[PDB]
Swiss-Prot record, chain A:
Its main location: cytoplasm. It comes from the Bacteria. It is found in: Cytoplasm; Host cytoplasmic vesicle, Host phagosome. Phosphorylated on Asp-54 by both DevS (DosS) and DosT. Phosphorylated on Thr-198 and Thr-205 by PknH. Phosphorylation by PknH enhances DevR dimerization. Aspartate phosphorylation and threonine phosphorylation cooperatively enhance DevR binding to DNA. PROSITE patterns: HTH_LUXR_1, HTH_LUXR_2, RESPONSE_REGULATORY. This is DNA-binding transcriptional activator DevR/DosR. The gene is devR.
From Swiss-Prot, chain B:
It is found in: Cytoplasm; Host cytoplasmic vesicle, Host phagosome. The modification 4-aspartylphosphate is found at residue 54. One of its GO terms (biological process) is regulation of DNA-templated transcription. This is DNA-binding transcriptional activator DevR/DosR. Induction: A member of the dormancy regulon. Moderately expressed under aerobic conditions, it is strongly induced in response to reduced oxygen tension (hypoxia) and low levels of nitric oxide (NO). The modification Phosphothreonine is found at residues 198, 205.
């Protein structure tokens, strides 16, 4: 079967999802967490095939969590709840073996981060050695660019989201008003296919499974 | 002249340093900032040669700030106040053209981060193209390794610090008690050569330039 781990800060949503996945004998809910810390301690212990995830968490966010989980467990499949228009489409994706768009997105971003890091640290190594690595690095990140559709500002914002910085920390770092950041985050999540249904619509759906 | 920018959240320390560098006609204080954000807005506008910096700030920290400043301004020389046993040794280092240890520490970290990033994002490209890239990255990072003296945990902490995370966010992410983080940070800073004198001793030194 498919071992599924649930990550969501709402009991009501966790219980509804447990109900949903329970009716499918092919699925096996092997644990749940209501925050980034819990999931970081519990997911590598349960070793699921798939993590089912809300982007909104009390102590960070789901982009941060996915990046952090993926570096420790590279083959983990990550499905954002609001990336699907319904729980049925989500369940189909699970059965289909879908990895989740956020996975490709995180890796795209890490390839691009690597270009920046070497870029910033290049005054340490040989002149010709630096240009050689720099060339091969951009080539790899230019081949694999799932984030090509984003502006620079959105790439940066995504980067900072993936660190688990708060909206206020992001605002301070990007010289934006906090309200503008909240808007930009939602614009960015929408652009990445992660606002296909609202948070309140997930809640109303899981709550009716009670 | 050497253009110097001061970053410290205590007015008493900024004034004392302004007094001190003003006595030297070879130095030119070109600006001051009392936070990460202020420094981020103001250093790229003043384009100093040197930033004189205290590791503790109200909205982040100096490792974070050096990292962010250096990515936009690669040639900036960054000198942490507590990396020197006295203001005289620090002034000597400004005169000598010293870049400051934090600079190469940060570039070392970045190289090592690049290894982890490609490590993590490698399932996207060719199996063979991935390895070749991976070898060339490690070879470049272990050849240039100023952080070699640190433990893995200290490397991770240093990375998290450079993102400007609070001690609480670091505790959460590293599964440590907050007071343990405070001790590990102070330990890591001391190991990096950045606690050659205390904060209180810097404060008392600048205070006696005013009174």
């Amino acid at each position: 079967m498919v071992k599924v781990f649930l990550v969501d800060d709402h009991e009501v949503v966790r219980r509804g999802l447990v109900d949903l996945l329970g009716a499918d004998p092919e699925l096996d809910v092997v644990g749940e967490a209501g925050s980034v810390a819990e999931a970081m301690a519990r997911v590598p212990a349960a070793r699921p095939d798939v993590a089912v995830l809300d982007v909104r968490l009390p102590d960070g966010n789901g982009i941060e969590l996915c990046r952090d989980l993926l570096s420790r467990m590279p083959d983990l499949r990550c499905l954002i709840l609001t990336s699907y228009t319904s729980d049925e489409a989500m369940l189909d994706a699970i059965l289909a073996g879908a990895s989740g768009y956020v996975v490709k997105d995180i890796k795209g971003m890490e390839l691009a981060r690597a270009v920046k890091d070497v870029g910033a640290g290049r005054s340490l190594l040989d002149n010709r050695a630096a240009a050689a690595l720099m060339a091969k690095l951009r080539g790899a990140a230019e081949k694999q660019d799932p984030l090509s559709g984003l502006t620079d500002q959105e790439r940066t914002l995504l980067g900072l989201l993936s660190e688990g910085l708060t909206n206020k920390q992001i605002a301070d770092r990007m010289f934006l008003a906090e309200k503008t950041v909240k808007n930009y985050v939602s614009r960015l999540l929408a652009k990445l296919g992660m606002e296909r249904r609202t948070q309140a619509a997930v809640f109303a759906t899981e709550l009716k499974r009670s």
